[PDB]
Design a protein around this ligand. Sequence first.
Ligand code: AFY
Ligand code: AFY
Lengths: 342, 343
Amino acid sequence: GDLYVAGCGVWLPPPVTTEQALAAGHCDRRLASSTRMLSVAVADKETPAEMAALAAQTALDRSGVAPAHVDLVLHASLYFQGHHLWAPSSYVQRVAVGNRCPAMEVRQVSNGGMAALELARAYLLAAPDRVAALITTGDRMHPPGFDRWSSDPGTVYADGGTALVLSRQGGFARLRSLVTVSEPVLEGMHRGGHPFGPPSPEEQRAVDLDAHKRAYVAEAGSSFSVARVSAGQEEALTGALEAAGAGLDDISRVVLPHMGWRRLSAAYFNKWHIQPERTTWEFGRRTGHLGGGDPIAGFDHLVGSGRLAPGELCLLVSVGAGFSWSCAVVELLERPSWAAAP
Amino acid sequence: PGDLYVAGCGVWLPPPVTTEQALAAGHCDRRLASSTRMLSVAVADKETPAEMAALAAQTALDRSGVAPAHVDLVLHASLYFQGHHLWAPSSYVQRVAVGNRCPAMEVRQVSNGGMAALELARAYLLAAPDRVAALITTGDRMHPPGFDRWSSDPGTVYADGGTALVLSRQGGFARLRSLVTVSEPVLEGMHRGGHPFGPPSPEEQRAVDLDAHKRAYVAEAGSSFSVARVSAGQEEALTGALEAAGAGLDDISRVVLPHMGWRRLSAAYFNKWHIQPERTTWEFGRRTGHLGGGDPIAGFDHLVGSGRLAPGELCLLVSVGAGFSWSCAVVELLERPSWAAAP
Ligand SMILES: CC(C)(COP(=O)(O)O)[C@@H](O)C(=O)NCCC(=O)NCCSC1(CC(=O)O)COC1
Ligand SMILES: CC(C)(COP(=O)(O)O)[C@@H](O)C(=O)NCCC(=O)NCCSC1(CC(=O)O)COC1
């Protein structure tokens, strides 16, 4: 019944600094100041499945899991994967695993990685003989259909891949809890059309979330909008902590989404009263938002850098547009052979 | 004790466009009309994919009688653009059709997406002792800018519409006797640019053109290899599902096939398995078109609602998508639901 993290890894393209973004007029100084971002991973020619596959190779090698024991492949993403009517999950399988288990996509906007983890956990527990599952994420947020800095002001989107190997047999960390909360009444906040009617039939030029958020608040009211988002976040946090038998004071590290400083302050630092030094803030602000993969990149970072110690608890915090929230408590059991000692 | 049932199902299909009208507009030529033998395809005007999925889910949930509190998962499958980036179509389906707060997400596996979500839904319900039902939906809209319903993938004509199915552990009008999924990722490169066995090419900025990528894959990997590997996956899914249900093909009363053109179905199924078109959903699919990954649901819903399937009879669901992935399922009709015609 127990579930473990057997391996994890990332593939991040080289960073583009905020200074170089300012120089190119991709970012203004107000956004630079409000987000306090330092750099964002930006890919040149690598596409999403390629980057996911590269992360899966690292995660699988670190795990020591045989390909015959990978019983599910789930690839999560939030933006165009490059080729319509093509199966990026099958590319990840062919290149990174080389086996024949089911391989498919799971999507839940910036929460896709945790959504895939929920489905992976269920899949592994539904049959007594299953062993491990591979979860990957990958996205590429290029200039013609997406604006990395202002398509969704307050969050700077990154290119890159992440991967995690979940196992029933064992691993270096134990999953103590995972909870997902859904508040679909917020659905219309990220689309055109009436917030409570059907979606408008036209849009794919350049994502402009800011326009839709204001239209949603106008129709639903700021009071309602702020409250429901707050309530969803609180349900996921307290649900995960209660399921793990922990309180926030038992948590050593908090893996937060890689959003800008203003957003993280309002949602987490000034609400929960935690210090940034207890989170992945410094990592995320040089990385950027990796679509649905931030919890994986952040946990991988904490472990690989030795910032998390055996016996310590880690809290994964993730959120997506629907809205959907996931929180997980992960217990580090031992330092993996790939990790730096402090 | 582990058993799973179909409690409800439904579709929402926009008005049809006939092959004659397609011929007249120069969307279809006589050789394509003749090779596919399509009669019409469902075409949406202003309805978006999640809108159509939500309408189908309303019908399916109303038919099932399952309360929203017993819907413990919502999975929305699709194969083409859902209309809005960084937006959650699965949350729209939840808000409009369910009104609850269980997890809602997307599952995708090309033209096999509906059966893929069925696999994950089944695991989810079986992974915890108190779960009851799950809602599965599909929805797509294949419009002219980036897609040509008649020639983006010649030999299959793609439809607009939504489908929905309610899976339950408590009961239903049909029992899921078996469900198996087969994966051959070596065929992955057949549906993209680049190099079949290298990384994908940079972002596809044009109308979908699968014929180009299939020719490039066959040139590189060989026709003998491609045809054999595709044939082997289809045969594995078929015999796996039938063996898992304790049935042989002669025990199947009706086959729900994908809504491809006549030439593809003949080569894959009619001439291979020696089954009659009259035992399949051929007549239904040829007036509907390919509903992305919802065909098994639409075809099963058609068979049940029209009374062509009788209590005690077994039904075989057949699905395939690029990747490749294949799913087959055997479903036993337990009773005629009250919304179904008597034959
Ligand atoms: C949670 C709290 C911050 C609490 O606020 P108080 O301090 O006012 O109680 C809340 O009231 C709030 O507004 N949060 C920001 C959400 C919003 O309204 N619009 C943007 C939503 S974009 C997003 C995409 C991403 O992942 O980057 C999807 O979720 C993030
Ligand atoms: C299938 C078979 C005929 C079986 O082998 P036998 O010919 O010996 O029977 C085989 O010979 C064959 O043709 N291989 C060529 C590949 C091909 O065209 N794939 C379609 C690509 S889009 C598609 C989705 C859909 O439309 O639903 C994914 O599957 C259809």
